[model samples]
Target: MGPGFDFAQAIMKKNTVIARTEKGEFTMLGVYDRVAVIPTHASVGEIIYINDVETRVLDACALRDLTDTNLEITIVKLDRNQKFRDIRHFLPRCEDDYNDAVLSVHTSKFPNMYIPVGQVTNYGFLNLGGTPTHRILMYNFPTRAGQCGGVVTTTGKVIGIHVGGNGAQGFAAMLLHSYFTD
Candidate 1:
């Protein structure tokens, strides 16, 4: 996995949607038919919409139960109606080989978009909140804010979820399958 690794062709709009909160909008990955994963930082209790359509964040399980790092993700409930027709293409399966090259499909708009692809550079700790401390995976490519919760994959297979951006580095949560148990 090197700088040559790319995934422009594997990027699919069906696997992700815009999760809008009072705080703002960010990318959210649909992991199940009715389950979507988001960054804990964007996980609010009220005013949540999926792809510009009204919805609720029901039965949300924030990773705060396990760690407070930026790598933590929130499992938000999604609708099964016409608003989320793209739910059929959700990728809940995760690849355990973290060494693989990956990309962050972090964008809120549809159509022409540019994504960042990078390999695991190192691990670090980011205290977003809570009392627990944990390490998070970091990559070389830099991502912008409000881009968290987007699916991080290798070629076309999902392996993790984008969680945070630190200047020239990006953070991702590899334990995506553990939160999609539904």
Candidate 2:
């Protein structure tokens, strides 16, 4: 035996892409909005890109920290207004198939929150940036100023967290759930 080794500042780089298992790899395309907010009536900007997933995680953490173990998952539909009533509504649901992972409309305060939400099946095999470096799908929803940068989980394993999106589309960018710590 010899001396123990220590490694620091290990730099790693990888490519991030969207793909379909049955089909092939895909590109992410979207339009950029010049203004961060679009006024509807007087001067109220709608909340876009709200990270309800992370909100759920924080809520859970606030209650209790989870152990480093995986567990079975279940699916459920949550309404927008449920956040105020109960945060558990934001938890991810385990669906039988792709069609079943639907999010409820009552979550958003705005009418344009009808965008489709999807669950992460497989985030690819590369640690592109961090542990949960996968694209999580969620319907387009508006969030207030303090809601970004939250955590999301399934069966106690954090899969992603909320991040700010393009500001214009009103969509929230969820980071890989594994990226969070207690």
Candidate 3:
């Protein structure tokens, strides 16, 4: 909304996938801003469906807890034997705070699905994970999600990876910086 971007319509991307195979298939919360289509972590040695194209994971890493955040921001490097999409890197506006700088967006990775657009009201970032990273206070998010993954975004870009929800609040790990590589 701030950038005059059509986040509501843009997120209608049909590229979402729950898994490729019928047996032992897994889900990955990927995001693409018309510039990049970074796939989510689907596990090493496993073949996944990214944009309908089969891609395999060459390697992955649960980044070290330099900030002591127990959360695991895992990343995977893929080998697109056929056709695949890789989320290109862009200069990140690094910080652990915000002012309605996100769109607590969500999508279906499991049977149940949801996508709520809420403004981040938390004045500053908190050390929920012992690491200083911005958290979204999606005023009234998580209306429903019998089962869903945490994939929050800010229009053309993503910010947090929704993990769980608190009593009446919501949670998403700040994944703004982890998805990129200079």
Candidate 4:
């Protein structure tokens, strides 16, 4: 592995967290530092664990018109400096360009333990009910149930957030840097 691989591993280790279901039924990706982002498929009531820190879901970026087809992302507001004290966070370069080879840091196997390596195959939209509006990046990777909402990146730059996938290909939502700040 080169520096690119090393960087991707470091980013995943520092930034990725676990979004665990309350009943212990399943787990998925929960990315955070300042603010956390989880898949909208996860109920807003789910708990987000960041280094043993149990945080609550603050808001969900869902579609108002459709009600069902949300943006496929949810936000968690946690105070790393206060309540969730001593939380270490790393911010990677946010690059939206369609890069070929990429890495997905997910909780499919374990937190940062199982990273899927693949290349983005296509670009499309998520059918969020009304109009296929949400931007999506399709990639060829082995995806499992618990990997949704993981961070997808190319070397050192953050590209997308894993939405979900079947056996053939996986999906990631376009990650907007502003989502972390705002």
**Backbone atom clashes (below 3 Å) for every candidate:** 0, 20, 1, 0
Summarize candidate 2's per-residue lDDT along 9-124 as a digit string, tens digits.
Answer: 00000111111112211111111111111101111112222232211111111111144222111111112233222222232333211221221121123211112233434322
lDDT of 4 by residue, 30-59 (tens): 354355666666655644554556765555
lDDT of 3 by residue, 128-152 (tens): 4354444333434543332223445
What 10-residue stretch in candidate 2 is worst by lDDT? Answer: 4-13
lDDT for each of the candidates? 0.58, 0.22, 0.43, 0.55
**Candidate 1 has which clashing residue pairs, if any?**
none
- TM-scores, in order shown? 0.72, 0.22, 0.55, 0.69
User: How far is each candidate from the true structure, as Cα RMSD in Å?
Assistant: 4.4, 20.0, 5.9, 4.9
The TM-score ranking, best first, is 1, 4, 3, 2
Candidate 2 Cα outliers beyond 4 Å, as residue runs: 1-137, 165-182
Candidate number with the higher lDDT (1 or 4): 1
C-alpha positional error of residue 178 in candidate 2 after TM-score superposition, expressed in Å: 8.4
| TM-score-better candidate, 2 vs 4 | 4
Stretches of candidate 3 exceeding 4 Å from the true structure: 1-5, 8-16, 19-27, 31-55, 82-92, 96-114, 121-139, 143-148
